[PDB]
Symmetry: D2
């Protein structure tokens, strides 16, 4: 994890969220006439994270009320935590930390997206071998490869924005979700509290309805899945025998993605929570979510750093493109010779010349020139042109433009 | 289940294959890529009633060339994964149509149960121990709100998933030259799919996104199933099943692990990868079938659900008033101190518990309380049905969108 | 986490394990003539766990402080021929051995508690449940003996994996200890004997079946703990009240976290070629977490079982809910001798169905059948309707589990 | 993928039902010997306990979810004079399904044992063949130091032997009879329940259970976790083979007369193992939910594993090894890969501390300049004066720094020289 994400989920931002929730609750309930107005004023003033005795801290939030109610003057502590249950404070605090977490994620995605836009543009036309099952296939450009990551990271951005409206929601339902101890002021307290914390008011309690938190986990799984692919591709291209790129780090992403994807499965498990309250499933989320958020930030940090100083070697990419000695663009030689020699003789002639060039480990050009019909109907510099892998890039540049233009 | 197994059959699958091949041949003729003799000849032999049914895409395309007279212009510029993944997208669209219909029925049934049992009192439970009274319609409304969120998640992923995959060997359609993008764009319109911003042969977020949604959806169904068999325990008997929630449990367990496999599959190298691709090809059909089975069972169980309010009333009376000790605290905090009401009535709950007797009987033995409230409701304060909170209004909030 | 279990996995005990390997390594290489006996003495003295200045370089940072503490340049005879993963993974093995020692102690106490509960409540009748619906009568000791057998099998699994896991990892950069020449195997075998570890048959830096196997065992073990927590807390329902806890909800989360961690460890087995940071770091993270989650689950189960709250009266009350329907099967057998096996079936089944729709005891409805009242009078029909008289061979099955 | 034909046949409806009928037949025989049912009835039941008399239409359709009863209803109504009504006596459905699954697992593990046996033999063969073939070891896909291909094969070989030990160890727990009735106590069998169980177990060549285990799923999950551990090794093998067969590497070649399929198998099997661990959370005495997880995952995991085993067996049997490519890749760093050997070789002639410092920075010089480490070392006037070139060029030879690869292989093969 990164210091930045690490302290978002520290005990200390956590209770700071607790105190902000208790302070907001007292103001709303004093504004509604539920608690004395002066009591809320004293409670809010002692809602400072610099006033907890960390040494005197079994009871997650109650330990913070015990030091709040027994801290205020004239028993004005009476009145904090009025009508709230423990999970109301934990889950709304968790929601606040998620929003802080996703702020970092959005910033990391922006830098990554920007790095990819630059790499896609810079290396728009740098030829390299595309690879299928780690075997060379047909030529592409490195910029084309980067544009495919860019489009994926943009889709992830869309997913992040879509879940925020569901996830950024208040949890305030009391013991069983109906806020029974507040009478006909429960919904009013809830709706104003959400307001006060800049959170969407809940349509109903969700203490055992964990689709909001699990949806965050599954998004982290989807996102780190893409980061793992980026890390794998980069260390594949920086192999000693490949050497097409160089790191300015990606091995850490692999572990992060593997841990996060299993954590997302655990959060789905937690969705099976019985009746109105369930400690067990709740404890899964209490453990996994901060772990997955920290793993994801480490992966994003490494990917961001690697991409910003990523180093590209077009000489190595061209060298690897030349390994097949013409065979990689055998399809191009088929069509290019179809106008001069006939649609099918071109197919049959280069295919048979392709087998020979393969079995003899010779350039495809050299075997084509051993065909007298080839050597008499079309000269060598036009056959070299067709055998050059750099002349068979397709519409990589226009596909790149299509990604860069939104 | 049959409709879901029909979508993912070898044979709806090949029908999807032939439709893509037919549509590709048509657009390629309109753009001047393939001759109009052959394009028209390929369309007729795009019949699943013409596959002789003895064993992927190339096996059906190799027959198709040796099928429509003299056809070898079909599959032009396309790779195998173009056909399989676009067919998978088409099957996902049909799959999600079934899911939308089942969710509609489930949401409608929950709209029932919230209204009927809006005021049916029952004991809420925390760690399977009674807490405070609620209503059965309130419990159903919390399920209804969740399923509505799932519906929104479904619509949101459709715009991404319903996309064409047509990129060729390495995604750049090199064999199509300056007609690659045009062929792609035209194929998408002909299949009513959005054109891709770029190839995604190894970019598996669309397919994994479908899986994680199935995991989120089946997670809620698993909760509904567990709560239902918990409420139908012999010792509880507050509901029943019509006359199969146990089948939902296994469906969700398999779907959630299958989603982890799809996230794993996103780790796919370079431009093509059979390994990770095969994870999706296996798990996605399995997860769809498990989800449809779970949805059908949930739909049927909710469609004819069993409710017994005097079972809930009997269970509410088990603690003999202790479950509504909070209600006595509020009503008694008006005459005494609200905090004094806490400590005095809590102390009464203790003796009422250790001696197994009602809270009403022990409260009357405290001279301070017996002076602030008469006998008649110390009852209704101890009556669990008089401490339901704003359950009915919370239900209205869910029913109104 | 638990107190004894962090500090096994604390950076302190880890660094202590690092220093023991380096100390043992120097002794081994001095006896073999690889390094001069100065440093074995000087390096061993500075392999104190209270001389380290706290503050990547997991292992390299600790040897840097070992060259910097030793005399006269003697300190760069330490770590000779070793790679970082040799020290980390051998430490992990030592920490796993310390971890499993706790697990065996917890398993012994849990087994001991179940042996007592199986004997105490051997004849305490209760309702068995299928899909959370009552089935036929059993005894509470029968339920406990079934847990006892499972934990005994778990004990067997732990002992079997110990001989594979308690193995040295000392292979150098690529496993062949190139820099040690013809002394590599001799160094390895002597070092393993110095640490009371089995010598490896070969290097296993990217062969993670030993570490993953530990994780799958934790998954199997916490799975049984998760069932125990579910049954106890299903029996502690307000509407059931058959047991009470003296603290099982935590086990549920522990088991769920362990089982996904085990899947991550299996994933880590996909490690390329001779060294792999990616997969190795999965294990570095998951193993300590799963050990602490498992120790917490074992602590709770141990405490809950030792102070288990058992109420036979509630078990008897729940047995009587069906009012004889629970032992309808026994009523047919006793009366099948007189009327015939299935004639008894259909007559009793049809009486049971009637007793259900009328919410009346099965004895009352059976006595309204003139044919049944002719083959058996009341004392016997009511003995047959007593759920306590249809426990099968529960007690004998208890003996089968208790007497090994 | 789909799985091998035998493994597909082991978990087919045909073989499963055949297992049912063997259990019912064995139960009838045991209970006739105990006087619980008449012998003529047991004899008539055994004669009709044959899978070739089952009408698959009545079972495939209209079977409402009756795994065993659909076959028992056809055994009762198949036997003459209503003698079939004596079958299934005292047994519950899960007794028949679980015991059948046990017998199917044993048949499955017979295949796995045979496949592991062949794979081990290929690895012993490959380890011996290429015991001295030099190649570059790789760390994070970067070259590290020289090893031999046989050393790499022996590291797989040692792993599979440990897997073979795990297989044998769980067999004694898994090959167990499940016969406990409705709640595990065989209530309807009275004082004959235990006698029926022990005799039925011996009749099926299974260990008698210590007690019922209808919701105690440690045996089945343990099978799943073993398949996870095993396919994990197979996935590493498939990954290493695909890495060594990259166009830019070309060190091995698959027979192709297959490794990518292993990756998907292992990924699905390891997630299935997690689901089986989840199934262990089964309440009270009977649980359809958790039991159905196992019913689904186990056959899938067995078929995925055999597919992975079949591919690995085939690939290892016809594996093409290219020592020239391995040698070509060893020479890529032009001596940098054995810089450590050059360090040690020069310590006596130059001083061990100068040898470290001088040769180390000569390496980065050779790296940034893309030149042989030999050429840069000769440009060091102190070295070039104490050291002729034919002697440095032995120290710069990657093939002269293999360590004890050969002897480590001996340990794995159990050569008499290893002891
Ligand atoms: Mg190694």
């Amino acid at each position: 994890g990164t210091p930045q994400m690490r302290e978002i989920w520290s005990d200390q931002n956590r209770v700071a969220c607790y105190l902000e929730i208790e302070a907001a609750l007292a103001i709303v309930q004093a504004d509604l006439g539920i608690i004395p107005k002066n009591a809320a004023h004293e409670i809010v003033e002692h809602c400072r994270v610099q006033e907890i005795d960390w040494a005197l801290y079994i009871g997650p939030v109650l330990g913070i009320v015990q030091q709040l109610v027994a801290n205020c003057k004239d028993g004005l502590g009476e009145y904090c935590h009025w009508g709230a249950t423990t999970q109301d404070i934990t889950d709304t605090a968790t929601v606040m930390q998620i929003r802080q977490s996703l702020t970092l994620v959005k910033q990391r995605l922006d830098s990554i997206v920007s790095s990819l836009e630059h790499l896609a543009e810079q290396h728009r036309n740098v030829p390299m071998a595309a690879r299928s099952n780690l075997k060379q296939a047909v030529p592409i450009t490195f910029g084309f490869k980067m544009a495919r990551f860019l489009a994926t990271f943009r889709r992830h951005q869309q997913r992040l924005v879509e879940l925020e409206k569901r996830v950024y929601t208040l949890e305030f339902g009391g013991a069983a979700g109906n806020l029974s101890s507040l009478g006909d002021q429960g919904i009013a307290t809830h709706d104003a509290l959400a307001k006060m914390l800049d959170l969407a008011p809940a349509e109903i309690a969700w203490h055992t309805e964990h689709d909001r938190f699990a949806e965050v986990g599954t998004f982290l799984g989807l996102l780190t899945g893409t980061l793992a692919k980026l890390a794998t591709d980069i260390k594949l291209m920086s192999q000693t025998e490949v050497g097409e790129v160089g790191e300015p780090s990606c091995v850490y992403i692999h572990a992060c993605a593997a841990n996060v994807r299993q954590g997302a499965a655990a959060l789905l498990d937690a969705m099976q929570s019985d009746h109105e309250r369930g400690t067990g499933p709740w404890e899964i989320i209490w453990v996994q979510l901060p772990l997955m958020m920290n793993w994801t930030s480490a992966a994003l940090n490494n990917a961001d750093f690697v991409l910003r100083g990523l180093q590209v070697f077009p000489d190595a990419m061209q060298h690897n493109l030349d390994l097949s000695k013409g065979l990689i663009v055998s399809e191009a030689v088929m069509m290019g010779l179809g106008n001069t020699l006939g649609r099918q003789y071109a197919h049959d002639a280069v295919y048979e010349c392709c087998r020979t060039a393969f079995v003899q480990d010779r350039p495809l050009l050299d075997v084509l020139l051993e065909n007298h019909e080839i050597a008499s109907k079309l000269d060598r510099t036009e056959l070299e042109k067709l055998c050059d892998p750099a002349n068979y890039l397709g519409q990589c540049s226009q596909w790149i433009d299509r990604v860069l233009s939104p």
